Design a protein around this ligand. Structure first.
Ligand SMILES: CCCCCCCCCCCCCCCC(=O)O
Ligand SMILES: CCCCCCCCCCCCCCCC(=O)O
Length: 129
């Protein structure tokens, strides 16, 4: 249950570079850059559900740690990959050559995505519920 909760974006680095390199329509890129998105996570042991809401875009995912899962990414593209826990508080995966690291520290989730030289970091904070 460690990750469960509702969290909202505080700040982020390199949103616009990252999002162009992954092929997000620039129209979504401009609408999306200053949105403070909400993520909802339900962890139950190894099973995760997470919903990411950014404006009108709602992206809902689920995965079992250690198993092949299908992840809907930024673009709508669904990619087969594995998510691993590296200790209770860290989720790690690689899709489309992006390394995603999600780390919970108390009430703060830091998410770092790297595609080559591009490091897209996001910092989110718990918001009751
Ligand atoms: C009004 C609708 C348009 C709103 C713009 C859509 C938001 C696009 C931003 C994509 C960010 C989602 C990736 C963050 C999830 C994560 O880092 O794990
Ligand atoms: C749409 C982006 C795909 C997400 C790929 C990461 C899969 C495992 C981690 C999910 C945790 C959700 C991230 C919450 C914090 C945040 O919004 O930055």
């Amino acid at each position: 249950s460690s990750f469960s909760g509702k969290y909202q974006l505080q700040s982020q680095e390199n949103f616009e570079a990252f999002m162009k390199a992954i092929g997000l329509p620039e129209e979504l890129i401009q609408k999306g850059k200053d949105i403070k998105g909400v993520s909802e996570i339900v962890q139950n042991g190894k099973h995760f559900k997470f919903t990411i809401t950014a404006g009108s875009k709602v992206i809902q995912n689920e995965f079992t740690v250690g198993e092949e899962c299908e992840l809907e990414t930024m673009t709508g593209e669904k990619v087969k990959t594995v998510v691993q826990l590296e200790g209770d508080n860290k989720l790690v995966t690689t899709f489309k050559n992006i390394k995603s690291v999600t780390e919970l520290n108390g009430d703060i989730i830091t998410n770092t995505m790297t595609l080559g030289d591009i490091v897209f970091k996001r910092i989110s904070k718990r918001i009751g519920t």
